Symmetry: D2
Amino acid sequence: CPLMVKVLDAVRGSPAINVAVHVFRKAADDTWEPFASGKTSESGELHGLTTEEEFVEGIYKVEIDTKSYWKALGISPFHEHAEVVFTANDSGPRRYTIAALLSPYSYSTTAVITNP
Amino acid sequence: CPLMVKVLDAVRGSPAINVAVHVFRKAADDTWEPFASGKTSESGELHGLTTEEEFVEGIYKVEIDTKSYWKALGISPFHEHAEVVFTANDSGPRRYTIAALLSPYSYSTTAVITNP
Amino acid sequence: CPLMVKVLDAVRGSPAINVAVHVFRKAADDTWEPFASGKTSESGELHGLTTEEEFVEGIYKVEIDTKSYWKALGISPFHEHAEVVFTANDSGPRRYTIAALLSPYSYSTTAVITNP
Amino acid sequence: CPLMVKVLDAVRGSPAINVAVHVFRKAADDTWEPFASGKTSESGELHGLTTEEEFVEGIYKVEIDTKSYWKALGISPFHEHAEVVFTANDSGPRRYTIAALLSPYSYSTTAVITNP
Ligand SMILES: O=C(c1cc(O)cc(F)c1)c1cc(O)c(O)c([N+](=O)[O-])c1
Ligand SMILES: O=C(c1cc(O)cc(F)c1)c1cc(O)c(O)c([N+](=O)[O-])c1
Protein backbone atom coordinates (compact mmCIF):
# COMPACT_ATOMS: atom_id res chain seq x y z
CA CYS A 1 0.00 0.00 0.00
CA PRO A 2 2.11 2.91 -1.29
CA LEU A 3 -0.55 5.63 -0.80
CA MET A 4 -3.07 6.07 2.00
CA VAL A 5 -5.34 8.98 2.90
CA LYS A 6 -6.50 9.62 6.45
CA VAL A 7 -9.14 12.21 7.40
CA LEU A 8 -9.97 13.40 10.93
CA ASP A 9 -12.75 15.57 12.40
CA ALA A 10 -11.63 18.30 14.84
CA VAL A 11 -15.21 19.21 15.86
CA ARG A 12 -16.29 15.72 16.95
CA GLY A 13 -12.86 14.39 17.88
CA SER A 14 -13.26 11.36 15.64
CA PRO A 15 -12.25 9.91 12.29
CA ALA A 16 -14.01 11.60 9.39
CA ILE A 17 -16.09 8.71 7.99
CA ASN A 18 -17.50 8.37 4.45
CA VAL A 19 -15.46 11.26 3.05
CA ALA A 20 -15.02 11.09 -0.73
CA VAL A 21 -11.41 11.25 -1.96
CA HIS A 22 -10.23 11.57 -5.58
CA VAL A 23 -6.61 11.17 -6.70
CA PHE A 24 -5.25 12.50 -10.00
CA ARG A 25 -1.91 12.43 -11.79
CA LYS A 26 -0.65 15.36 -13.85
CA ALA A 27 -0.61 14.63 -17.59
CA ALA A 28 1.83 15.99 -20.16
CA ASP A 29 -0.63 18.74 -21.15
CA ASP A 30 -0.88 19.65 -17.42
CA THR A 31 -4.47 18.51 -16.95
CA TRP A 32 -5.48 16.14 -14.16
CA GLU A 33 -5.92 12.54 -15.30
CA PRO A 34 -8.01 10.63 -12.73
CA PHE A 35 -5.99 7.94 -11.01
CA ALA A 36 -7.94 6.46 -8.07
CA SER A 37 -10.79 7.31 -5.71
CA GLY A 38 -12.67 6.03 -2.69
CA LYS A 39 -14.40 6.82 0.60
CA THR A 40 -12.83 6.81 4.05
CA SER A 41 -13.50 3.88 6.37
CA GLU A 42 -14.78 3.85 9.97
CA SER A 43 -11.19 4.65 10.97
CA GLY A 44 -11.01 7.66 8.62
CA GLU A 45 -8.57 5.80 6.38
CA LEU A 46 -8.68 5.01 2.67
CA HIS A 47 -6.40 2.13 1.63
CA GLY A 48 -5.78 0.29 -1.61
CA LEU A 49 -5.77 3.30 -3.91
CA THR A 50 -2.86 2.09 -6.04
CA THR A 51 0.01 -0.37 -6.38
CA GLU A 52 3.79 -0.15 -6.12
CA GLU A 53 4.22 -0.51 -9.88
CA GLU A 54 1.44 1.93 -10.78
CA PHE A 55 2.57 4.66 -8.34
CA VAL A 56 5.47 6.03 -10.37
CA GLU A 57 7.21 9.38 -9.91
CA GLY A 58 5.13 12.38 -10.89
CA ILE A 59 2.90 15.11 -9.52
CA TYR A 60 -0.28 13.87 -7.84
CA LYS A 61 -3.38 15.70 -6.60
CA VAL A 62 -5.54 14.45 -3.72
CA GLU A 63 -8.99 16.09 -3.60
CA ILE A 64 -10.94 15.61 -0.36
CA ASP A 65 -14.67 16.39 -0.53
CA THR A 66 -14.81 18.31 2.73
CA LYS A 67 -17.90 20.31 1.73
CA SER A 68 -20.17 17.26 1.41
CA TYR A 69 -18.83 15.92 4.73
CA TRP A 70 -19.83 19.08 6.61
CA LYS A 71 -23.14 19.40 4.74
CA ALA A 72 -24.11 15.85 5.70
CA LEU A 73 -23.48 16.83 9.35
CA GLY A 74 -25.57 20.00 9.02
CA ILE A 75 -22.61 22.35 9.53
CA SER A 76 -21.79 25.37 7.33
CA PRO A 77 -18.35 24.88 5.73
CA PHE A 78 -15.98 27.44 4.23
CA HIS A 79 -14.02 25.45 1.64
CA GLU A 80 -15.25 23.87 -1.57
CA HIS A 81 -12.83 20.98 -0.95
CA ALA A 82 -9.33 20.36 0.35
CA GLU A 83 -6.71 19.80 -2.37
CA VAL A 84 -3.23 18.41 -1.67
CA VAL A 85 -0.76 18.50 -4.58
CA PHE A 86 2.67 16.90 -4.25
CA THR A 87 5.52 15.24 -6.15
CA ALA A 88 5.94 11.52 -5.42
CA ASN A 89 8.96 9.20 -4.99
CA ASP A 90 11.51 11.71 -6.24
CA SER A 91 14.18 9.90 -4.19
CA GLY A 92 12.67 6.42 -4.53
CA PRO A 93 9.25 5.05 -3.59
CA ARG A 94 8.24 4.95 0.07
CA ARG A 95 4.82 4.68 1.71
CA TYR A 96 2.84 7.94 1.70
CA THR A 97 0.13 8.76 4.21
CA ILE A 98 -1.69 11.99 3.33
CA ALA A 99 -3.55 13.12 6.46
CA ALA A 100 -6.06 15.94 6.82
CA LEU A 101 -7.56 17.34 10.04
CA LEU A 102 -10.83 19.10 9.26
CA SER A 103 -12.73 21.99 10.81
CA PRO A 104 -15.57 23.92 9.15
CA TYR A 105 -13.43 27.02 8.49
CA SER A 106 -9.94 25.54 8.60
CA TYR A 107 -7.96 22.46 7.78
CA SER A 108 -4.46 21.10 8.38
CA THR A 109 -2.69 18.58 6.15
CA THR A 110 0.56 16.67 6.52
CA ALA A 111 2.54 13.95 4.83
CA VAL A 112 3.83 11.01 6.85
CA ILE A 113 6.36 9.11 4.74
CA THR A 114 7.92 5.85 5.93
CA ASN A 115 9.94 2.96 4.56
CA PRO A 116 9.05 -0.79 4.85
CA CYS B 1 -9.55 45.38 2.09
CA PRO B 2 -12.22 42.77 1.40
CA LEU B 3 -9.58 40.07 0.81
CA MET B 4 -6.26 39.71 2.62
CA VAL B 5 -3.81 36.79 2.54
CA LYS B 6 -1.41 36.13 5.41
CA VAL B 7 1.37 33.53 5.40
CA LEU B 8 3.44 32.40 8.38
CA ASP B 9 6.51 30.17 8.68
CA ALA B 10 6.27 27.51 11.42
CA VAL B 11 9.96 26.57 11.18
CA ARG B 12 11.41 30.02 11.87
CA GLY B 13 8.46 31.43 13.84
CA SER B 14 8.13 34.42 11.55
CA PRO B 15 6.06 35.86 8.72
CA ALA B 16 6.64 34.15 5.40
CA ILE B 17 7.99 37.05 3.30
CA ASN B 18 7.90 37.40 -0.52
CA VAL B 19 5.49 34.49 -1.04
CA ALA B 20 3.76 34.70 -4.41
CA VAL B 21 -0.04 34.47 -4.29
CA HIS B 22 -2.41 34.12 -7.27
CA VAL B 23 -6.19 34.55 -6.98
CA PHE B 24 -8.69 33.15 -9.51
CA ARG B 25 -12.46 33.32 -9.81
CA LYS B 26 -14.72 30.70 -11.34
CA ALA B 27 -16.40 31.88 -14.54
CA ALA B 28 -19.87 30.94 -15.76
CA ASP B 29 -18.30 28.33 -18.08
CA ASP B 30 -16.55 26.71 -15.06
CA THR B 31 -13.05 27.88 -15.97
CA TRP B 32 -10.69 29.71 -13.58
CA GLU B 33 -10.21 33.36 -14.55
CA PRO B 34 -7.18 35.22 -13.15
CA PHE B 35 -8.53 37.70 -10.59
CA ALA B 36 -5.56 39.22 -8.70
CA SER B 37 -2.00 38.43 -7.63
CA GLY B 38 0.82 39.73 -5.43
CA LYS B 39 3.62 38.84 -2.96
CA THR B 40 3.53 38.86 0.86
CA SER B 41 5.21 41.85 2.57
CA GLU B 42 7.65 41.91 5.48
CA SER B 43 4.71 41.21 7.80
CA GLY B 44 3.63 38.14 5.84
CA GLU B 45 0.53 40.00 4.65
CA LEU B 46 -0.76 40.69 1.15
CA HIS B 47 -3.18 43.65 1.00
CA GLY B 48 -4.80 45.48 -1.87
CA LEU B 49 -5.77 42.47 -4.00
CA THR B 50 -9.30 43.71 -4.76
CA THR B 51 -12.05 46.23 -3.96
CA GLU B 52 -15.52 45.86 -2.50
CA GLU B 53 -17.05 46.58 -5.93
CA GLU B 54 -14.93 44.01 -7.78
CA PHE B 55 -15.18 41.29 -5.11
CA VAL B 56 -18.63 40.02 -6.06
CA GLU B 57 -20.26 36.72 -5.11
CA GLY B 58 -18.44 33.76 -6.59
CA ILE B 59 -16.14 30.82 -6.06
CA TYR B 60 -12.54 31.96 -5.55
CA LYS B 61 -9.23 30.10 -5.58
CA VAL B 62 -6.17 31.36 -3.66
CA GLU B 63 -2.96 29.63 -4.81
CA ILE B 64 0.01 30.19 -2.48
CA ASP B 65 3.40 29.36 -4.03
CA THR B 66 4.77 27.53 -1.02
CA LYS B 67 7.23 25.51 -3.11
CA SER B 68 9.30 28.50 -4.28
CA TYR B 69 9.31 29.81 -0.71
CA TRP B 70 10.89 26.62 0.65
CA LYS B 71 13.23 26.12 -2.30
CA ALA B 72 14.76 29.57 -1.74
CA LEU B 73 15.59 28.43 1.82
CA GLY B 74 17.26 25.29 0.40
CA ILE B 75 14.36 22.99 1.33
CA SER B 76 12.61 20.60 -1.04
CA PRO B 77 9.07 20.60 0.38
CA PHE B 78 6.31 18.06 -0.04
CA HIS B 79 3.61 20.28 -1.57
CA GLU B 80 3.63 21.98 -4.97
CA HIS B 81 1.53 24.84 -3.57
CA ALA B 82 -1.26 25.43 -1.08
CA GLU B 83 -4.64 26.03 -2.72
CA VAL B 84 -7.66 27.44 -0.88
CA VAL B 85 -11.01 27.34 -2.71
CA PHE B 86 -14.15 28.91 -1.27
CA THR B 87 -17.45 30.62 -1.99
CA ALA B 88 -17.35 34.32 -1.10
CA ASN B 89 -20.09 36.83 -0.22
CA ASP B 90 -22.92 34.28 -0.39
CA SER B 91 -24.75 36.13 2.44
CA GLY B 92 -23.67 39.62 1.43
CA PRO B 93 -20.29 41.35 1.49
CA ARG B 94 -17.71 40.22 4.05
CA ARG B 95 -14.03 40.84 4.72
CA TYR B 96 -11.92 37.68 4.38
CA THR B 97 -8.47 36.94 5.76
CA ILE B 98 -7.03 33.74 4.30
CA ALA B 99 -4.19 32.58 6.54
CA ALA B 100 -1.68 29.80 5.92
CA LEU B 101 0.89 28.41 8.37
CA LEU B 102 3.71 26.63 6.50
CA SER B 103 6.03 23.73 7.33
CA PRO B 104 8.06 21.76 4.76
CA TYR B 105 5.72 18.72 4.88
CA SER B 106 2.56 20.28 6.26
CA TYR B 107 0.41 23.35 6.22
CA SER B 108 -2.66 24.67 7.96
CA THR B 109 -5.09 27.18 6.53
CA THR B 110 -7.95 29.13 8.10
CA ALA B 111 -10.43 31.85 7.23
CA VAL B 112 -11.13 34.83 9.49
CA ILE B 113 -14.31 36.55 8.33
CA THR B 114 -15.73 39.80 9.67
CA ASN B 115 -18.81 41.83 8.79
CA PRO B 116 -17.94 45.47 7.89
CA CYS C 1 3.70 45.49 22.62
CA PRO C 2 6.40 42.90 23.33
CA LEU C 3 3.78 40.18 23.93
CA MET C 4 0.46 39.78 22.12
CA VAL C 5 -1.97 36.85 22.21
CA LYS C 6 -4.35 36.15 19.35
CA VAL C 7 -7.11 33.52 19.37
CA LEU C 8 -9.17 32.36 16.40
CA ASP C 9 -12.23 30.11 16.11
CA ALA C 10 -11.96 27.43 13.38
CA VAL C 11 -15.65 26.47 13.63
CA ARG C 12 -17.13 29.91 12.92
CA GLY C 13 -14.19 31.33 10.94
CA SER C 14 -13.88 34.33 13.22
CA PRO C 15 -11.83 35.80 16.04
CA ALA C 16 -12.39 34.10 19.37
CA ILE C 17 -13.76 37.00 21.46
CA ASN C 18 -13.68 37.37 25.28
CA VAL C 19 -11.24 34.49 25.81
CA ALA C 20 -9.52 34.72 29.18
CA VAL C 21 -5.71 34.52 29.06
CA HIS C 22 -3.34 34.21 32.04
CA VAL C 23 0.44 34.67 31.75
CA PHE C 24 2.95 33.30 34.28
CA ARG C 25 6.71 33.51 34.59
CA LYS C 26 9.00 30.91 36.12
CA ALA C 27 10.67 32.12 39.32
CA ALA C 28 14.15 31.22 40.54
CA ASP C 29 12.60 28.61 42.88
CA ASP C 30 10.86 26.96 39.87
CA THR C 31 7.35 28.10 40.77
CA TRP C 32 4.98 29.90 38.37
CA GLU C 33 4.47 33.55 39.32
CA PRO C 34 1.42 35.38 37.91
CA PHE C 35 2.75 37.86 35.35
CA ALA C 36 -0.24 39.34 33.45
CA SER C 37 -3.79 38.52 32.38
CA GLY C 38 -6.62 39.78 30.17
CA LYS C 39 -9.41 38.86 27.71
CA THR C 40 -9.32 38.86 23.89
CA SER C 41 -11.02 41.83 22.16
CA GLU C 42 -13.47 41.85 19.25
CA SER C 43 -10.52 41.17 16.93
CA GLY C 44 -9.41 38.11 18.91
CA GLU C 45 -6.33 40.01 20.09
CA LEU C 46 -5.04 40.73 23.59
CA HIS C 47 -2.65 43.70 23.72
CA GLY C 48 -1.04 45.56 26.58
CA LEU C 49 -0.05 42.58 28.73
CA THR C 50 3.47 43.85 29.49
CA THR C 51 6.20 46.38 28.67
CA GLU C 52 9.67 46.04 27.21
CA GLU C 53 11.19 46.79 30.64
CA GLU C 54 9.10 44.21 32.50
CA PHE C 55 9.37 41.47 29.84
CA VAL C 56 12.83 40.24 30.80
CA GLU C 57 14.48 36.95 29.87
CA GLY C 58 12.69 33.98 31.36
CA ILE C 59 10.41 31.02 30.84
CA TYR C 60 6.81 32.12 30.33
CA LYS C 61 3.52 30.24 30.37
CA VAL C 62 0.45 31.47 28.45
CA GLU C 63 -2.75 29.71 29.60
CA ILE C 64 -5.73 30.23 27.27
CA ASP C 65 -9.11 29.39 28.82
CA THR C 66 -10.47 27.52 25.82
CA LYS C 67 -12.90 25.50 27.92
CA SER C 68 -15.01 28.47 29.07
CA TYR C 69 -15.03 29.76 25.50
CA TRP C 70 -16.57 26.55 24.15
CA LYS C 71 -18.92 26.05 27.11
CA ALA C 72 -20.47 29.49 26.53
CA LEU C 73 -21.30 28.33 22.98
CA GLY C 74 -22.93 25.17 24.41
CA ILE C 75 -20.01 22.90 23.50
CA SER C 76 -18.25 20.53 25.87
CA PRO C 77 -14.71 20.56 24.45
CA PHE C 78 -11.92 18.04 24.88
CA HIS C 79 -9.24 20.29 26.41
CA GLU C 80 -9.28 22.01 29.80
CA HIS C 81 -7.20 24.88 28.38
CA ALA C 82 -4.42 25.48 25.89
CA GLU C 83 -1.04 26.11 27.53
CA VAL C 84 1.96 27.55 25.68
CA VAL C 85 5.32 27.48 27.51
CA PHE C 86 8.44 29.07 26.06
CA THR C 87 11.73 30.81 26.77
CA ALA C 88 11.60 34.51 25.87
CA ASN C 89 14.32 37.04 24.98
CA ASP C 90 17.17 34.51 25.16
CA SER C 91 18.98 36.36 22.32
CA GLY C 92 17.87 39.85 23.31
CA PRO C 93 14.47 41.55 23.25
CA ARG C 94 11.91 40.38 20.69
CA ARG C 95 8.22 40.97 20.02
CA TYR C 96 6.14 37.79 20.37
CA THR C 97 2.70 37.02 19.00
CA ILE C 98 1.28 33.81 20.47
CA ALA C 99 -1.55 32.62 18.24
CA ALA C 100 -4.03 29.82 18.87
CA LEU C 101 -6.59 28.40 16.43
CA LEU C 102 -9.39 26.61 18.30
CA SER C 103 -11.70 23.68 17.49
CA PRO C 104 -13.70 21.70 20.07
CA TYR C 105 -11.34 18.69 19.96
CA SER C 106 -8.19 20.26 18.57
CA TYR C 107 -6.07 23.35 18.60
CA SER C 108 -3.01 24.69 16.85
CA THR C 109 -0.60 27.23 18.27
CA THR C 110 2.24 29.19 16.69
CA ALA C 111 4.69 31.94 17.54
CA VAL C 112 5.37 34.91 15.28
CA ILE C 113 8.54 36.67 16.42
CA THR C 114 9.93 39.92 15.07
CA ASN C 115 13.00 41.98 15.94
CA PRO C 116 12.09 45.62 16.83
CA CYS D 1 -5.46 0.04 24.93
CA PRO D 2 -7.60 2.93 26.21
CA LEU D 3 -4.96 5.67 25.70
CA MET D 4 -2.44 6.12 22.90
CA VAL D 5 -0.20 9.04 21.99
CA LYS D 6 0.96 9.68 18.43
CA VAL D 7 3.58 12.29 17.47
CA LEU D 8 4.39 13.47 13.93
CA ASP D 9 7.16 15.66 12.45
CA ALA D 10 6.01 18.37 10.01
CA VAL D 11 9.59 19.30 8.98
CA ARG D 12 10.70 15.82 7.91
CA GLY D 13 7.28 14.45 6.98
CA SER D 14 7.70 11.43 9.24
CA PRO D 15 6.71 9.99 12.60
CA ALA D 16 8.45 11.71 15.48
CA ILE D 17 10.55 8.85 16.90
CA ASN D 18 11.97 8.54 20.44
CA VAL D 19 9.90 11.42 21.83
CA ALA D 20 9.47 11.25 25.61
CA VAL D 21 5.86 11.39 26.84
CA HIS D 22 4.67 11.72 30.46
CA VAL D 23 1.05 11.30 31.57
CA PHE D 24 -0.31 12.62 34.87
CA ARG D 25 -3.66 12.54 36.67
CA LYS D 26 -4.94 15.46 38.71
CA ALA D 27 -4.97 14.75 42.45
CA ALA D 28 -7.43 16.11 45.01
CA ASP D 29 -4.99 18.88 45.99
CA ASP D 30 -4.75 19.77 42.25
CA THR D 31 -1.15 18.66 41.79
CA TRP D 32 -0.12 16.29 39.01
CA GLU D 33 0.35 12.70 40.17
CA PRO D 34 2.46 10.80 37.61
CA PHE D 35 0.46 8.08 35.90
CA ALA D 36 2.43 6.60 32.97
CA SER D 37 5.27 7.46 30.61
CA GLY D 38 7.16 6.18 27.59
CA LYS D 39 8.88 6.98 24.29
CA THR D 40 7.31 6.94 20.85
CA SER D 41 8.01 4.00 18.54
CA GLU D 42 9.29 3.97 14.95
CA SER D 43 5.69 4.73 13.94
CA GLY D 44 5.48 7.74 16.27
CA GLU D 45 3.06 5.88 18.53
CA LEU D 46 3.18 5.11 22.24
CA HIS D 47 0.93 2.21 23.29
CA GLY D 48 0.32 0.38 26.54
CA LEU D 49 0.28 3.41 28.83
CA THR D 50 -2.62 2.17 30.96
CA THR D 51 -5.47 -0.30 31.31
CA GLU D 52 -9.25 -0.12 31.05
CA GLU D 53 -9.68 -0.47 34.81
CA GLU D 54 -6.92 2.01 35.70
CA PHE D 55 -8.07 4.71 33.25
CA VAL D 56 -10.98 6.07 35.28
CA GLU D 57 -12.75 9.40 34.80
CA GLY D 58 -10.69 12.42 35.76
CA ILE D 59 -8.49 15.16 34.38
CA TYR D 60 -5.30 13.94 32.70
CA LYS D 61 -2.22 15.79 31.45
CA VAL D 62 -0.04 14.55 28.58
CA GLU D 63 3.39 16.22 28.45
CA ILE D 64 5.34 15.74 25.21
CA ASP D 65 9.07 16.55 25.38
CA THR D 66 9.20 18.45 22.11
CA LYS D 67 12.26 20.49 23.10
CA SER D 68 14.56 17.46 23.43
CA TYR D 69 13.24 16.10 20.12
CA TRP D 70 14.21 19.25 18.23
CA LYS D 71 17.51 19.61 20.10
CA ALA D 72 18.52 16.06 19.16
CA LEU D 73 17.88 17.02 15.50
CA GLY D 74 19.94 20.21 15.81
CA ILE D 75 16.96 22.53 15.30
CA SER D 76 16.11 25.55 17.48
CA PRO D 77 12.68 25.04 19.08
CA PHE D 78 10.29 27.59 20.57
CA HIS D 79 8.35 25.60 23.17
CA GLU D 80 9.59 24.04 26.39
CA HIS D 81 7.19 21.13 25.79
CA ALA D 82 3.70 20.47 24.48
CA GLU D 83 1.09 19.90 27.20
CA VAL D 84 -2.38 18.48 26.52
CA VAL D 85 -4.86 18.57 29.42
CA PHE D 86 -8.28 16.93 29.10
CA THR D 87 -11.11 15.25 31.01
CA ALA D 88 -11.49 11.53 30.29
CA ASN D 89 -14.49 9.18 29.87
CA ASP D 90 -17.07 11.68 31.11
CA SER D 91 -19.72 9.84 29.07
CA GLY D 92 -18.19 6.37 29.43
CA PRO D 93 -14.75 5.03 28.49
CA ARG D 94 -13.74 4.92 24.84
CA ARG D 95 -10.32 4.66 23.20
CA TYR D 96 -8.37 7.94 23.20
CA THR D 97 -5.66 8.78 20.68
CA ILE D 98 -3.87 12.03 21.54
CA ALA D 99 -2.02 13.16 18.41
CA ALA D 100 0.47 16.00 18.04
CA LEU D 101 1.95 17.39 14.81
CA LEU D 102 5.21 19.18 15.58
CA SER D 103 7.08 22.09 14.01
CA PRO D 104 9.90 24.04 15.67
CA TYR D 105 7.74 27.13 16.31
CA SER D 106 4.26 25.62 16.21
CA TYR D 107 2.31 22.52 17.04
CA SER D 108 -1.18 21.13 16.45
CA THR D 109 -2.93 18.60 18.69
CA THR D 110 -6.16 16.67 18.33
CA ALA D 111 -8.12 13.94 20.04
CA VAL D 112 -9.39 10.98 18.03
CA ILE D 113 -11.90 9.06 20.15
CA THR D 114 -13.43 5.79 18.97
CA ASN D 115 -15.43 2.89 20.36
CA PRO D 116 -14.51 -0.85 20.09
O1 LIG E 1 -4.40 31.11 10.84
C1 LIG E 1 -3.72 31.41 11.76
C2 LIG E 1 -3.20 30.29 12.66
C3 LIG E 1 -2.96 29.03 12.12
C4 LIG E 1 -2.50 28.01 12.93
O2 LIG E 1 -2.24 26.74 12.42
C5 LIG E 1 -2.29 28.23 14.28
C6 LIG E 1 -2.54 29.47 14.81
F1 LIG E 1 -2.33 29.67 16.13
C7 LIG E 1 -3.00 30.50 14.01
C8 LIG E 1 -3.41 32.90 11.98
C9 LIG E 1 -4.28 33.82 11.42
C10 LIG E 1 -4.07 35.18 11.57
O3 LIG E 1 -4.97 36.09 11.00
C11 LIG E 1 -2.96 35.63 12.27
O4 LIG E 1 -2.74 37.01 12.41
C12 LIG E 1 -2.08 34.72 12.82
N1 LIG E 1 -0.93 35.22 13.54
O5 LIG E 1 -0.85 36.36 13.80
O6 LIG E 1 0.08 34.35 13.94
C13 LIG E 1 -2.30 33.35 12.67
O1 LIG F 1 -1.59 14.45 10.55
C1 LIG F 1 -2.05 14.19 11.60
C2 LIG F 1 -2.29 15.34 12.57
C3 LIG F 1 -2.68 16.57 12.06
C4 LIG F 1 -2.89 17.65 12.91
O2 LIG F 1 -3.30 18.89 12.40
C5 LIG F 1 -2.71 17.49 14.26
C6 LIG F 1 -2.30 16.27 14.77
F1 LIG F 1 -2.12 16.14 16.11
C7 LIG F 1 -2.08 15.20 13.94
C8 LIG F 1 -2.37 12.72 11.90
C9 LIG F 1 -1.79 11.75 11.09
C10 LIG F 1 -2.03 10.40 11.31
O3 LIG F 1 -1.43 9.42 10.50
C11 LIG F 1 -2.87 10.02 12.34
O4 LIG F 1 -3.13 8.66 12.57
C12 LIG F 1 -3.46 10.98 13.14
N1 LIG F 1 -4.33 10.53 14.20
O5 LIG F 1 -4.78 9.20 14.20
O6 LIG F 1 -4.66 11.27 15.05
C13 LIG F 1 -3.22 12.33 12.92
